[model samples]
Target: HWGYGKHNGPEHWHKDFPIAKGERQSPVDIDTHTAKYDPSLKPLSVSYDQATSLRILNNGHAFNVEFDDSQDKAVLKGGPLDGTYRLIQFHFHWGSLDGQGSEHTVDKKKYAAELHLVHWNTKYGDFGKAVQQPDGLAVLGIFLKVGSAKPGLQKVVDVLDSIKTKGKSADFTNFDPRGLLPESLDYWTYPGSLTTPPLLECVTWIVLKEPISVSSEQVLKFRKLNFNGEGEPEELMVDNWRPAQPLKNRQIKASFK
Candidate 1:
């Protein structure tokens, strides 16, 4: 029953999902000046199979493109990880206004939107089980800035019309998620929980440094999606992003100086 409205937003999440008040909550403000660069951090290795892309859907909270993770066909390795993690799905978070939408901020700077590529550790066997483990999930957070039209992103944007309402989905195949990433894999890593409820603390947050571009018009298209399901009150799905949480005792590590 939790939503991003003033009544059920992040500020009130702690009442239901007690973990929201935990030490390792995600989407923290990344103070670049204080982020320590670790020379030992390995470059991220991402290999995706275009055919693994299954479909795109609006799940009330956000629009996600699910992938076939039956095997190691599409995975993310290296980069502060101990083993390979299978790509399960990718989603986006944004605000009603283009000025502030991102979940994670850099030196208090917010971007237009943020992309989350969700992965589950293979050792746990499946996403359902892995999601409960501390090191089970590795989420790649890519910031989206309003700039020139990004061809890679346009492919997904074009399908938005089909899934405008919550629970609507359309077939999405032969999509290589690698095309959505920035040239550099430089990122800041931290231990954190999911931004949404049940707000599991199983994610190893990998927030990238360089952001990809998305045209201003394209962002407006994302806002067109509905948070309310068909026949329900029409609530636009904007500001589906949690504000920055406290860093607490966690350290944010950087792959590049």
Candidate 2:
């Protein structure tokens, strides 16, 4: 299985998935000096419905909370996007320890973790078809820091016990993802690819500048999850993040200075 192990980690991914070296690869390091402030960057608009929350699954890589996108009940708009984008799923990329698991870093500073809320462009009809276009996807990334316990984020950590194994899933519903976000909308916008395999360069990344807090104990709980399935040595699912890619010629736009 594709994983973040020494033998089959991010470096080895390019052997099977060539686009891992593509121009617009994600999980980039945002250099504030290199990033430009854009006055025209629109404030992001997020419309979510609690009913759209479906279930949570351990996909052998990370735990994902799925959402129902049959209709536009929950959608993301504005902030470097041309049209409505429907929320499909959200997941985390963390480390085995407390300060080194985030995929995207700022000024070379790594946080405790990072969360990705994935949305697909509706113009492309479905998520499968949307991945084919450069503008087919929009991902909202929020950084997580170690601090006092976060009331909203605790709900997610509480479920790690039920779905600790790969392929395990639980009934998780009526949960609003908005509760997990920071009060500010300030962010950095860039054109990038999915941080995972196939490494499709289709995401319009809007990474929030403000980070949310999570308890030190809560951060350790996720390590209880196994990277492999029911059998085999239980490898703790940690350090599941891709290193930052080159900026190339892409421009980084800031919503706020």
Candidate 3:
């Protein structure tokens, strides 16, 4: 129903929204060393479609891109993120603990945070049209760790001073999430469910093996944001990440040889 923290956080999501049990899930723990299947046959690459009109939204959660489509080829179309899909909005999951962020955890090795590159199959035309397709959704997972500083995220962080109050967002000037992709796009894929409410079994998870590094300061900036004023007064958006779920009988597949 809600999200991964406070009233709408992970634990309570299913209670509010039961569809998660059936929807495809995400944030899966992948083993790059051992993938059983490959999607070499499916490669529908669409361009990044970078346009100046690419606007960003705050939606009371994380900063997101909210503009027209681009064809600049800034992103990937061959691997898990194919062109059959159109870029929707992007968001992230963080953690209260230092070493245990990320919505999906493999073998219990938690990184710092998880970046979600959300997309929908363009077969239905735009996101509104494609969302109905079961295979219409794809999420590129990027692991975030507090380490080196990032200038790319500065604009994303500037809003913290004002919207730091949780469920808040700002204008997000000239910020491109594609600039945040890790050098190594290597990743693992599988059939899973959503990490949040209704933890559905609809997602086709694409988790990248290479983790993008973030400065400790950036991590701090994330925690600094408030959460509708519900969490401890000590911190807001303090623990925005959800704990990793069991695979049940799921197997993670990789793309590279």
Worst 10 residues of 2 by lDDT: 45-54
Off by over 4 Å in 2: none
Error of 2 at 134 (Å): 0.4
Q: Which digits, one per residue and each the tens of the lDDT, describe model 3 over residues 69-126?
A: 4442233366654455556666777777778778777666888888887766655566
Tell me which of candidates 1 and 3 scores higher on TM-score. 1
lDDT pick, better of 1 and 2: 1
Flag regions of model 1 displaced more than 4 Å. Answer: none
Once all C-alphas are superposed, what RMSD does model 1 give against the true structure? 1.0
Residue 187's C-alpha lDDT in candidate 1?
Answer: 94
TM-score against native, each model: 0.98, 0.98, 0.81
Model 3 C-alpha lDDT versus the unseen true structure? 0.63
lDDT per model vs. reference = 0.93, 0.91, 0.63
Top-down lDDT ranking? 1, 2, 3
Candidate 1: minimum summed lDDT over ten consecutive residues — where? 42-51
How does model 1 fare in lDDT? 0.93
